[PDB]
Amino acid sequence: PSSSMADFRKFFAKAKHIVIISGAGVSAESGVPTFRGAGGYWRKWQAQDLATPLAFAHNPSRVWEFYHYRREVMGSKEPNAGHRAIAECETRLGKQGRRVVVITQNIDELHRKAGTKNLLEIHGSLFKTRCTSCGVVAENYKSPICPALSGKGAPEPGTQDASIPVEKLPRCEEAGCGGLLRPHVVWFGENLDPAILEEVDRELAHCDLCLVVGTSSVVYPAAMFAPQVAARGVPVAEFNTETTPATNRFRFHFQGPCGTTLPEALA
């Protein structure tokens, strides 16, 4: 792939429907832990170990400690220069009748905090719950999410399981329900939301320029979205700290922290 910013900027000046696909690389630049690399653990586990219907079925306390930790950590995190350039570009182009859509694998809401309005959160959100009895999905920014979790969730190896009984984990507040809540986060082995997938398929079919930003952690189907666009002849620009297994299918590859490359690219 090319690293000609001048060539990318030519396409950028004319594009009417831009899809930006973001992965954890963009969150790591704001210091948000991801729990996925070689070496990236919470206690003795990684995200793929805890973000699973198996972990929740067998140890819902532990899975809640882990998402509690992640919610509380966000308290003190801010969107970075890459989130901002993406949000500013959306705003600016929309005044020109041009469309920018962000499809994000991230669940941390930093794009939303930066001002991105056209945001498809394909793996859900740290700050949503879903009731496992009635299925209602609700916003929840409470700190702590329930009292039994106050002080829990510490990441250090050695840390004991809180072992909170299911009755004192987060519970649905809908009148007449009382069911156990779960994070409204898509786990490994589960279906993505069919409504969101329809949007994603439609946006990808219309777009005339695709950006792929901080997607070194490979997850399906998201890792297929940009190859699908490139396979139609549409230019794809990858902004990442390293190459990925799909890099050789894209038109552009710009190496470096997204925070350094995006502000220039999207000016």
């Binding site: 793929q48 793996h123 898509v186 786990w187 490994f188 082995g189 589960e190 279906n191 993505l192 069919p194 997938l197 952690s217 490979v218 997850v219 399906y220 189907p221 890792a223 297994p245």
Partner: peptide, 10 residues
């Protein structure tokens, strides 16, 4: 239906 699945081949 389309599932979330970890990429392993690399």
């Amino acid at each position: 239906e389309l599932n979330k699945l970890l990429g392993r081949v690399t």
